[PDB]
Nucleic acid binder design. Structure first.
Ligand code: MG
Ligand code: MG
Ligand code: MG
Ligand code: MG
Ligand code: MG
Ligand code: MG
Ligand code: MG
Ligand code: MG
Ligand code: MG
Ligand code: MG
Ligand code: MG
Ligand code: MG
Ligand code: ZN
Lengths: 175, 123, 138, 36
RNA sequence: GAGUCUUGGAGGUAGAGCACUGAUUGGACUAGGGGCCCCUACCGGGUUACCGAAUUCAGUCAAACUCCGAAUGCCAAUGAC
RNA sequence: UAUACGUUAAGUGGAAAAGGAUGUGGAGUUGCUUAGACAACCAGGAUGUUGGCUUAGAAGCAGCCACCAUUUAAAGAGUGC
RNA sequence: GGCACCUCGAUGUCGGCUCAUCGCAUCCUGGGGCUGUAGUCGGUCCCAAGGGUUGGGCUGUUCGCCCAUUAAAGCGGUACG
């Protein structure tokens, strides 16, 4: 089938707003979200109904026609409840802690590594061996978790370093 | 769509005899559980305890338009044919309970089928 | 190594290779075979190099049928020499191939096995080939 | 593993394109390869 | 004298084919025996998986192979422009 | 900086091949399919049964029976890891 | 090595010295992927031309062997500068 053809509801507090040049925004119980779209593409919304009218078929139109819909879906979902992603931390003593608003991780390096997030996203730590990022949008938490993981990639010979909240790494043997 | 005509015209004689039937869950069926239960049916009677699982709703709509106008609402539902073509079904109800309570096979969406005009609470 | 036992002469013009294949352009001693889409000079070692692989991949179920045969001899003067003062010494034998001639043939195996074997043999020859099966009407 | 002829090895190697190049990516990184 | 159009000749190239000279692929028949064994001791026979003269079935090649064979070029003729 | 219809996205145009590939434009052949197709998700994937077999179970890939039919809604008594 | 287009009213050839400059198919330093990489050392491939890249013994020597160091003691073009 196709994903650019499904439908999208709109909760009560979630209020979308159409504007010239197709630059829809959203007002919800967790913050705002604006994202300009392609000028050619047509966006049309009804109460509890989302529609993406596509012009004559082409190679790039069948792509944009799904991209915009997926983005609107992610947007309404984030403004409804928001996304998050945890970060397990195995170590043999590798431990993360909190300091004001920023993050500090004492990996095997010889000096503490500092990680500070941008505005609109917070970094919570529920325990000294786990990190959990929380934010409204999806690409933001994605990028923040990637930049936090890229401090210490997981070694394959033994689980050592940062890894995602649920993932399997391969294992060799060393003697 | 050739052999499907054959099977939909064959199952007429199959469904034009029984009185009581019951439905089986679709998923969570262990082939080990399946062979044990089918050998249990084997040690009681013949294979008349159906395990027919090629059973998309249209054979129901083209088979049971005469009698039993209920399976249509169980179309989008876990379906597995199982009928009674032998003496009065109570022992099959006992096997159904002791197979479907909590072990290795779930009841789930099972509500039974029709005797003459009825939906649930078979005896 | 294929070569003729006796020959009339031992040196010969190189000829020309314009046109199409006079004959031999239909698989009849077997079921499958590879056709030739270009014209070149298949040597005496390339043929057996392809044949060993083609017969080794298969399980000797079906037998192969080489159709070409090195006949024309060609020469080569020794190295580090000026030009002129006679013609060179015979070196080896070659075989002329023209667009459309069926080179190899397989029969007595399945279809996928035959296709893969012919493909494995096609990489040892200096021409661009295609896979053709026996005519169905005969 | 750069080479002018890329093709899957096991059954689970995919073939994609990036920036106008031909890449074969897989789960076992011994199979990852790129044309040109 | 020259060009062109009708008419007639000599001549074996391109191309094709196996009618001869050679080179060759796979079957039937594979003769007469070949080695082994029954023992050819002094027979014949199972394989000689035959090395192979025959023939036949089909299938390929050839500047110093032709049962064949052009388009051009060449030599003339009586008429016309 | 004419008219008309197409093709290319590389600055190909404005220097090369064997080989490789869900680039794109066509013309076909062709199996399945609103008794419902492919994907994705919810299911299981062994029973005279690992059977006659082997260094240790070899109980799936010591490695050999066409290691078989059955329960059947379905299994090579293994597709691979 | 082949050819014989230019130069016979004249261009004289190898090593070393002084001075260099360019290419990248990278010797070192810089950044990465796979590993039959546990660590220290390695292997092979990718990006990269900014700088650096030795003192002697034997031989006319290019070449070559040896001694002692060095992060490394690169390969080539410039009329074999
Ligand atoms: Mg012929
Ligand atoms: Mg000729
Ligand atoms: Mg001739
Ligand atoms: Mg160009
Ligand atoms: Mg001269
Ligand atoms: Mg001359
Ligand atoms: Mg001059
Ligand atoms: Mg002068
Ligand atoms: Mg480079
Ligand atoms: Mg001295
Ligand atoms: Mg010089
Ligand atoms: Mg020079
Ligand atoms: Zn792979």
């Amino acid at each position: 089938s196709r994903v650019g053809k499904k439908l999208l509801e709109i909760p009560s507090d979630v209020t979308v707003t159409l504007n010239d040049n197709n630059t829809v925004a959203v007002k919800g119980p967790k913050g705002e979200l604006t994202r300009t779209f392609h000028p050619d593409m047509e966006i049309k919304v009804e109460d509890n109904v989302l529609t993406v009218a596509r012009p004559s078929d082409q190679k790039e139109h069948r792509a944009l026609h799904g991209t915009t819909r997926s983005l609107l879906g992610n947007m309404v979902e984030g403004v409804s409840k928001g996304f998050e992603r945890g970060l397990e931390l195995v170590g043999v003593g590798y431990r993360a802690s909190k300091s004001g608003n920023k993050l500090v991780l004492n990996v095997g390096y010889s000096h503490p590594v500092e990680i500070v997030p941008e505005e609109g996203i917070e970094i919570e730590v529920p325990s000294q061996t786990k990190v959990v990022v929380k934010g409204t949008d999806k690409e933001r938490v994605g990028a923040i978790a990637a930049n936090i993981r890229a401090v210490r990639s997981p070694e394959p010979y033994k689980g050592k370093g940062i890894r995602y909240e649920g993932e399997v790494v391969r294992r060799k043997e060393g003697k | 769509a050739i052999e499907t005509k054959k099977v939909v015209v064959e199952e007429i004689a199959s469904k034009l005899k029984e009185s009581k039937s019951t439905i089986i869950v679709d998923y969570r069926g262990l082939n080990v559980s399946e062979v044990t239960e089918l050998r249990k049916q084997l040690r009681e009677a013949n294979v008349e305890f159906k395990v027919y699982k090629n059973t998309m709703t249209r054979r129901a709509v083209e088979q049971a338009e005469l009698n039993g106008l209920n399976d249509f609402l169980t179309g989008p539902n876990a379906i597995a044919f199982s009928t009674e073509d032998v003496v009065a079904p109570a022992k099959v109800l006992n096997d159904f309970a002791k197979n479907h309570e909590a072990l290795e096979i779930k009841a789930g969406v099972i509500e039974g089928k029709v005797s003459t005009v009825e939906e649930v609470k078979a005896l | 190594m294929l070569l003729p036992k006796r020959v009339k002469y031992r040196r010969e013009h190189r000829g020309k290779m314009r046109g199409r294949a006079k004959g031999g352009t239909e698989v009849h001693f077997g079921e499958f075979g590879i056709q030739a889409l270009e014209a070149s000079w298949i040597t005496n070692r390339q043929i057996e190099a392809a044949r060993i692989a083609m017969t080794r991949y298969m399980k000797r179920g079906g037998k192969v049928w080489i159709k070409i045969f090195p006949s024309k001899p060609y020469t080569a003067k020794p190295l580090e020499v000026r030009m002129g003062s006679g013609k060179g010494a015979p070196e080896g034998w070659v075989a002329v191939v023209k667009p459309g001639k069926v080179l190899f043939e397989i029969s007595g195996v399945s279809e996928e096995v035959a296709r893969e074997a012919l493909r494995l043999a096609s990489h040892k020859l200096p021409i661009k080939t295609k896979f053709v099966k026996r005519e169905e009407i005969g | 593993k750069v080479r002018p002829s890329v093709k899957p090895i096991c059954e689970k190697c995919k073939v994609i394109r990036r920036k106008g190049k031909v890449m074969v990516i897989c789960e076992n990184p011994k199979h990852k390869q790129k044309q040109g």
